[PDB]
Enzyme design. Structure first.
Site: not given
Lengths: 143, 524, 491, 508
Positions: B50, B83-84, B389
């Site tokens: 994550d 976010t990645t 998530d």
């Protein structure tokens, strides 16, 4: 060695301005003299600009240009050799500032050529012929 | 201890720093993604794919990277999805900028281009949006599940993850009201027990907390007894018993009369306090300190289970759904000062003898706390993150019925659109709008590189079918199925999420490209 | 580790290219070279830069081979073949960092060149062997950068007509070694003497006895110095030259003494043999070739079959010039020898002026080698970039991505021309592309106009061979450097 | 020591100029400054840059002094005073090397600032009601200053938050503190909301609130410096016991004492109870039974303005409250702006202040339009305070530079070189206005010189289209006193730098 860019441009300025320090004081009938010394110990002191440059030992390769251009002024005309170095060093010093302001060297050269092309016209205006001697002799004050 | 560097060369230092940030997070993108080893300050070993935790535990000293992380937090906080991709895309946007800087494009001319290019990309994405909620409500529930499994099938639970999706889709169905048109994700608490298996996780319709009844003779289930004010919970700091200090006593006893006299005091305070439980209106009692055995037996006649040594926040979580209060003394308690529920029952889970407490309203509850198990303590930590998530996956699918068919296909679809607008530039900005596409290509490229596919030919494979054929989803095969078409594989991302990914990344370009000086002062 | 070997090969070659990048254009920046012989030279000539660079890097010595090949192929723009090589290597570095194996890279550059040559053939402005208007037009514009380009208008028919005579209309090859330019002091810049035969730099016997001319003259070459350590020996040596009736004698310049002792010189006078001295090694290769004769090193090996034949042998002494011309060779094995005498003011002027005409002779050869004129100012490089970018959009696979990087590299020529002109680099290339969206040959980087215009209208065109060989030879270098896998010493 | 101390002092001034160089202009760049508190700021505000600049060189501390004063003395110009002052030092490098004494240099600068300000006075145009008013003038200036931002599409909403927000302020006592700015995460720019009152956090870690009346048509505000609580939702506190039977009695007694304070407040009758310290659960339900509002976490910035808004005050005592401590507004309500709790007062008729609550996609996204509203507030502030208008966007520096050249044409002597440099230095403003904007500085400056020399005194830098245009007509208006006090400020700054010939350091 590979020296290019801001380095070679700054080194060329240090050389030309250094050469000017040898000619700076030689201009004028009230001039200050400079003395040159060789290895065997012979010394000479002169206010003659052609002699000052002719005997000058210049090692930096940019100054070898200044001398070659100065000698031609003497061989061709025989006067105006002092003005060559003094004019040149101020041109380059102020040119270095132009380079630092993001003006391409080609742009600087092009415009310097334009100013000369105009200058000859202004010289034509301000100059006068061999006159001011008939009816009044200003050559009296030259005498 | 400050920096000195003059000219645009300072921006080369800034961008080269960002390439270090990307070299960390890059390999984490994708269901075939590679994990990072996280050395905790205390030596604890954490393994995660994550990027939120990777960036949170990532420690870098270049202040430019601290900006990249602090700004990426907004992707996790507001949306909670990719976010990645914010960091990966931003790095590519800065990498293409490094080329533009050397070409002599003024820093602002770069920024103005990324802004207008995003106006083109987001608009062209909208032209291709789809309505996941179309047609019937049962179809909404169906497609809602089909997508939720795509976020849960990428974790360790992927074996039987459909069960974690069972609780997820059914939870948000219980927690979502189409009349409200919103989902308060705080209404769902994530909690489990260390150990177990996937099938040992449960869908709990109410509150469950790490507690069990403190006395085995008390009833394991309390009911309103047909018509009472449900089951009230006493939330106090002191026990219902003759007062007994938990620090020091120092009670001088001068004689046998005085010695046993305290037992006389205890008998009246035993019955008084356990009557003050019933009179105060508590059906079970939970206090920060435990309860005297003789009081406990007098509580039995009234069916008054109790629990000892419980913190306020855990009882607060109950009091949120039951409307309870932390009243300083038991005398001011009422049916309302003590919060009410319908049923409290203690559930044993096979070989798990913990026997946890569950508080339900015998109806649609205002909160649910689902039950998670997993064969390793650390698996549970990540498994609940998957529920976190996947809870946000369905939360966004509720917020916006508009979805995109993802897997890099939308990025390539947008990339092709940028190349379509390249010919219409015919100006200085043509240098920049084209680079936006070269950056958009780094997302499907990264998706392929983390999957073991050709890093270049994959881009031409996706572009070939998305250009010469149709805007039909042509994705990356990272899942290991036969071919492209995420519409067939039901791999779907939220539209509003991808919009935020593009817009937030553009903001990062405005932030990094417009910082000309890093002045790091000292400390006295 | 071959990745480390390739890294060094690319970095080294890029440093050579970044050295020449400033030299392209009439406004180019000058490079200073301090040589190991102790001479510091300053020049903008590109081959001069790489020739005096004295490259020690084994990988970068291939870049000199690129320059010389471009010079022997077309003979103009040899600065650009190094710059083009540099950009293709810099783009290759981007390709290598993307993880594309050099073999895939090299073969993709091969396919790009095949398409690139075709692109140049499309934009070809048609020429013709009889078209003396465009031949004189372009040739004098290639002389436009010279000291006095106003007198080059008259130097134009010198180069144009002299080559059109030596070269057949339907011909694929012209030999520039068969056109010899010889300087001579005196005259004016427009004054040159073009001779349809070999021209001898010396006259008849130096001392009294020189016959100065011969009719039915048979030309032999006896090269060995004749002097005493004597009468019969020195005399009999030259006697046999009379025996076979050889009327003109060429003698190689000797490092010992003057050609021949006066005994055998005045004897050669008594033999009625015209004596030509101080012939150079390369002069023999020029002179004995067109005459159809075989040179003899010694004085003993004189034979009969090596006799020549010359219709006209006379001394051309104009204002004290003193150079001999020989015409009417009529040898079955010979070729149409052309030699020019360059008149002018100062010895230093005519020396450089001769070299300015060698540049022009290459231009006309390029037009005979391959017909066509191409826009200057880097216009063909912008046009090729657009076409290969258009073709790369339909091309599929990693071969397309490399084709795209090739197009990016093609900008190094229009970019370098714009930078050395002092125009905003992005502004110029942006305008170049916008103009190429409408026009084809209507575009180009103009120094005089400080902008984009039609170099055809500005009278700036370049042989299509120059551009074709520039791309072709560059792809050969890119292959050569990318194929370097390791460097080992042999002993 | 000597003239070389000046050379070193000038080199120090160059460092300050080059650092603040990129900060000039609405298109300018930010500086990242890491403080000793580990808090890092990224800002284009020269005042923020100055507060954290951390200058150690005694010569450059002078530049900080004149700039920090420029902020409070005038209110704007913290960047231009450092740019102009620094270039007047850079232009002094060739004059010092040629041997021109520091008096000769400073004397001419003092003569120049007198000759220059006279022309700034000539240029001022009196614009108060001049063919305009609030709705026209302030919109023409605010809509311009707020252009070229992330609100490019949503200007009408930030013009509403700008012009009507400041125009509604007390104009007899007008200051920036009258508008507060609060960052509300979440929402959209076209949806960002402004309020007449001040807002509060009310984000306690304890849940169970909102089941309490948050709204009153005539509230009665009582502010305490003390907490109203007994049982804390998270931590706890030591309670002392005297007897094993009194172990739980002191807990009952602790109820009595806090119930007693809450009981006396129960009777006090404040419909709003504000506190600077947290509020506990005993008070949570207690005041719910009283059906009045009570919340902690109130700042003096919020509370002192509440005092103006409702007419209350602060009194921690429960029995000694004087009626003057309580006040009432036309409406109070805790606002749920952006799906987040921010309590505020709504429509207080005695309030002389207001608050802009900023909604947006992200905190930094808000920050971009946040400091934009910060500037926009000042745009109107000066539009009302200063009737004397000079053309902004570099037009003033063009106008002055021409008059300076004419003084150097007429004035002969050693003053000629100094006057010319004073003019050359005024081109650093349009130069940095162009280099920070992304234009061709040589082209624009040459077109500025030629265009101004044609007789147009309103030409200036146009940021929308790279061109020179009439910034007076573009309503790019700047106060005369800002340019006057800035020019006088810089001249005195150069008198301080050029006049130092020695640095004496006491080490220990």
């Amino acid at each position: 060695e590979k020296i290019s860019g801001d380095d070679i441009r700054n080194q060329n300025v240090l050389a030309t301005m250094a050469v000017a320090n040898v000619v700076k004081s030689s201009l004028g009938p009230v001039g200050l003299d400079k003395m040159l010394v060789d290895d065997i110990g012979d010394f000479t002191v002169t206010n003659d600009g052609a002699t000052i440059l002719s005997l000058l030992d210049v090692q930096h390769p940019a100054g070898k240009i200044l001398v070659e251009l100065a000698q031609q002024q003497d061989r061709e005309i025989g006067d105006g050799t002092t003005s060559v170095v003094i004019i040149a060093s101020e041109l380059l010093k102020r040119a270095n500032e132009l380079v630092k302001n993001k003006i391409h060297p080609t742009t600087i050269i092009t415009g310097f050529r334009v100013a000369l092309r105009e200058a000859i016209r202004f010289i034509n205006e301000v100059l006068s012929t061999s006159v001011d001697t008939l009816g009044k002799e200003t050559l009296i004050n030259i005498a | 201890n400050k920096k000195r560097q003059h000219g645009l060369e300072a921006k080369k230092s800034h961008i080269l720093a960002a390439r270090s940030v990307a070299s960390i997070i890059k390999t984490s993108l994708g269901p075939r993604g590679l994990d990072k080893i996280l050395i905790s300050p205390d030596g604890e070993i954490t393994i995660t794919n994550d990027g939120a935790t990777i960036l949170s535990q990532m420690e870098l000293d270049n202040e430019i990277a601290k900006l990249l992380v602090q700004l990426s937090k907004s992707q996790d906080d507001e949306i909670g999805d990719g976010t990645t991709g914010v960091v990966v895309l931003a790095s590519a946007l800065l990498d293409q900028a490094l080329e533009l800087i050397q070409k002599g494009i003024h820093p602002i001319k770069i920024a103005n281009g990324f802004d207008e290019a995003a106006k083109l990309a987001i608009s062209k994405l909208e032209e291709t949006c789809d309505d996941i909620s179309a047609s019937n409500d049962e179809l909404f529930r169906d497609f809602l599940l089909r997508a939720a499994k795509t976020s849960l099938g990428s974790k360790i639970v992927s074996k039987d993850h459909d069960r974690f999706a069972e609780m997820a889709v059914e939870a948000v169905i219980n927690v979502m009201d189409k009349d409200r048109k919103d989902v308060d994700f705080d209404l769902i608490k994530m909690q489990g027990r260390v150990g177990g298996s996937i099938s040992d996780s449960k869908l709990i319709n109410g509150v469950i907390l790490d507690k069990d009844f403190s006395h085995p003779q008390m009833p394991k289930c309390v009911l309103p007894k047909e018509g009472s004010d449900g089951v009230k919970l006493a939330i106090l700091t002191c026990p219902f018993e003759p007062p007994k200090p938990k620090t020091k006593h120092k009670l001088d006893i001068s004689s046998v009369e005085e010695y046993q006299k305290l037992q006389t005091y205890e008998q009246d305070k035993f019955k008084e306090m356990i009557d003050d439980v019933k009179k105060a209106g508590a059906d079970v009692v939970i206090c920060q300190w435990g309860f005297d055995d003789e009081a406990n037996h007098l509580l039995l006649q009234n069916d008054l289970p109790a629990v000892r040594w419980v913190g306020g926040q855990e009882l607060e979580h109950i009091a949120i759904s039951t409307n309870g209060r932390i009243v300083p003394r038991f005398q001011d308690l009422s049916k309302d000062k003590l919060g009410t529920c319908s049923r409290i029952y203690e559930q044993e889970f096979g070989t798990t003898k913990d026997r946890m407490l569950i508080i339900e309203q015998s109806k649609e509850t205002k909160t649910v706390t689902c039950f998670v198990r997993g064969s390793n303590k650390m698996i549970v930590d990540e498994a609940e993150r998957a529920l976190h998530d996947s809870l946000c996956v369905v939360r966004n699918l509720v917020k916006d019925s508009r979805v995109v068919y993802g897997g890099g296909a939308a990025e390539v679809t947008m990339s092709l659109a940028v190349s379509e607008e390249a010919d219409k530039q015919r100006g200085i900005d043509q240098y920049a709008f084209r680079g936006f596409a070269q950056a958009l290509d780094t997302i499907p490229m990264t998706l392929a590189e983390n999957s073991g596919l050709d890093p270049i030919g994959t881009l031409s494979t996706l572009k070939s079918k998305q250009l010469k054929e149709k805007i039909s989803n042509i994705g990356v095969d990272c899942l290991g199925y036969g071919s492209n078409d995420m519409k067939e594989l039901f791999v779907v991302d939220p539209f509003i999420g991808k919009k935020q990914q593009i817009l937030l990344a553009t903001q990062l370009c405005r932030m990094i490209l417009k910082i000309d000086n890093v002045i790091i002062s000292g400390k006295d | 580790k071959p990745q480390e070997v390739r890294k060094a090969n690319i970095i080294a070659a890029r440093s050579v290219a970044d050295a020449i990048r400033t030299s392209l254009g009439p406004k180019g920046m000058d490079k200073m070279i301090k040589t190991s012989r102790g001479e510091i030279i300053i020049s903008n000539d590109g081959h001069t830069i790489l020739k005096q660079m004295a490259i020690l890097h084994p990988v970068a010595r291939m870049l000199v081979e690129v320059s010389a090949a471009q010079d022997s192929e077309a003979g103009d723009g040899t600065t650009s073949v190094v710059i083009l090589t540099g950009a293709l290597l810099g783009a290759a570095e981007r390709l290598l960092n993307k993880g594309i194996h050099p073999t895939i890279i090299a073969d993709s550059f091969q396919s790009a060149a095949k398409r690139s040559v075709d692109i140049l053939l499309e934009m070809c402005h048609k020429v013709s062997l009889s078209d003396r208007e465009q031949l004189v037009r372009a040739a004098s514009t290639s002389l436009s950068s010279k000291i006095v380009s106003q007198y080059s208008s008259f130097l134009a028919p010198l180069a144009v007509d002299s080559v059109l005579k030596i070269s057949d209309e339907n011909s694929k090859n012209v030999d520039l070694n068969d056109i010899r330019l010889v300087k001579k002091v005196g005259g004016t810049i427009d004054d040159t003497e073009m001779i349809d035969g070999v021209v001898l730099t010396q006259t008849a016997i130096k001392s009294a006895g020189g016959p100065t001319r011969k009719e039915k003259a048979k030309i032999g070459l006896i090269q060995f110095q004749i002097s005493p350590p004597e009468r019969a020996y020195l005399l009999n040596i030259c006697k046999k030259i009379k025996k076979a009736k050889c009327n003109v004698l060429l003698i190689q310049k000797s490092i010992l003494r003057d050609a021949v002792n006066d005994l055998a010189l005045h004897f050669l006078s008594k033999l009625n043999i015209m004596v030509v001295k101080d012939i150079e090694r390369e002069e023999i290769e020029f002179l004995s070739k067109g005459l159809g004769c075989k040179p003899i090193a010694d004085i003993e090996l004189f034979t009969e079959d090596r006799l020549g034949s010359a219709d006209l042998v006379e001394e051309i002494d104009s204002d004290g010039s003193k150079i001999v011309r020989v015409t009417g060779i009529r040898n079955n094995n010979a070729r149409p020898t052309v030699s020019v005498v360059i008149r002018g003011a100062n010895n230093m002027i005519i020396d450089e002026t001769e070299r300015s005409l060698h540049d022009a002779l290459c231009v006309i050869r390029c037009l005979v080698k391959e017909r066509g004129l191409i826009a200057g100012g880097g216009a063909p490089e912008i046009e090729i970039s657009r076409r290969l970018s258009k073709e790369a959009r339909s091309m599929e696979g990693v071969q397309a991505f490399i084709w795209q990087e090739f197009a990016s590299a093609l900008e190094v020529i229009p970019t370098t021309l714009a930078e050395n002109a002092g125009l905003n680099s992005i502004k110029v290339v942006t305008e170049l592309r916008s103009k190429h969206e409408n026009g084809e040959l209507n575009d180009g980087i103009s120094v005089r106009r400080s902008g984009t215009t039609n170099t055809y209208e500005e009278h700036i065109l370049q042989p299509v061979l120059v551009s074709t060989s520039a791309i072709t030879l560059a792809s050969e270098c890119v292959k050569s450097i990318l194929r370097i896998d390791d460097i080992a010493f042999s002993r | 020591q000597g003239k070389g101390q000046i050379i070193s002092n000038i080199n120090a001034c160059v460092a300050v100029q080059e650092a603040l160089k990129p900060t000039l202009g609405p298109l300018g760049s930010d500086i990242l400054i890491v403080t000793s508190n580990q808090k890092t700021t990224i800002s284009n505000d020269g005042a923020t840059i100055l507060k954290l600049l951390d200058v150690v060189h005694p010569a450059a501390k002078t530049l900080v002094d004149i700039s920090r004063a420029q902020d409070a003395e005038v209110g704007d110009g913290t960047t231009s005073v450092t740019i102009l002052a620094g270039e007047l030092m850079k232009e002094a490098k060739p004059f010092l090397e040629e041997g021109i004494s520091s008096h000769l240099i400073m004397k001419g600068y003092r003569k120049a600032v007198s000759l220059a300000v006279e022309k700034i006075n000539e240029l001022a145009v009196d614009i108060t009601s001049e063919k305009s008013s609030g709705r026209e003038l302030l919109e023409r200036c605010a809509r311009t200053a707020m252009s070229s931002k992330l609100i490019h599409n949503n200007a009408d909403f930030f013009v509403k938050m700008c012009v009507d927000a400041v125009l509604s302020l007390d104009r007899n006592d007008l200051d920036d503190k009258l508008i507060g700015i609060k960052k509300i995460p979440g929402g959209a720019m076209e949806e960002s909301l402004f309020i007449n009152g001040v807002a509060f956090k009310k984000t306690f870690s304890y849940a169970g609130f909102e089941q309490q009346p948050k709204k009153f048509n005539n509230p009665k505000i009582l502010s305490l410096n003390v907490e109203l609580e007994l049982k804390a939702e998270k931590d706890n506190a030591e309670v002392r016991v005297e007897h094993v039977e009194d172990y739980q009695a002191i807990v009952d007694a602790e109820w009595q004492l806090i119930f007693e304070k809450l009981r006396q407040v129960e009777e006090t009758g404040a419909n709003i109870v504000l506190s600077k310290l947290p509020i506990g659960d005993l008070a949570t339900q207690f005041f719910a039974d009283r059906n009045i509002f009570c919340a902690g976490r109130v700042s003096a910035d919020d509370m002192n303005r509440v005092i103006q808004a409702v007419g209350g005050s602060i009194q921690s005592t429960t029995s000694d409250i004087k009626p003057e401590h309580l006040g009432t507004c036309a409406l109070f309500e805790e606002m749920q702006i952006g799906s987040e709790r921010y309590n505020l007062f709504q429509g207080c008729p005695q309030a002389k202040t207001c608050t802009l609550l900023l909604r947006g996609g992200a905190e930094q996204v808000i920050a971009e339009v946040e400091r934009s509203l910060h500037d926009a507030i000042m745009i109107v502030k000066r539009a009302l305070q200063n009737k004397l208008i000079v053309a902004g966007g570099g037009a003033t520096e063009m106008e002055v530079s021409k008059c300076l050249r004419d003084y150097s044409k007429t004035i002969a002597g050693k003053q000629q070189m100094i006057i010319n440099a004073f003019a050359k230095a005024l081109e650093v403003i349009p130069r940095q206005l162009c280099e920070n904007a992304g234009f061709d500085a040589i082209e624009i400056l040459n077109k500025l010189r030629l265009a101004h020399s044609k007789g147009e005194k309103w030409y200036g830098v146009v940021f929308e289209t790279e061109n020179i245009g009439d910034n007076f007509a573009k309503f790019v208006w700047e106060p005369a006193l800002v340019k006057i006090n800035a020019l006088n400020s810089a001249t005195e700054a150069t008198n301080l730098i050029l006049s130092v010939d020695e640095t004496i350091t006491n080490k220990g």
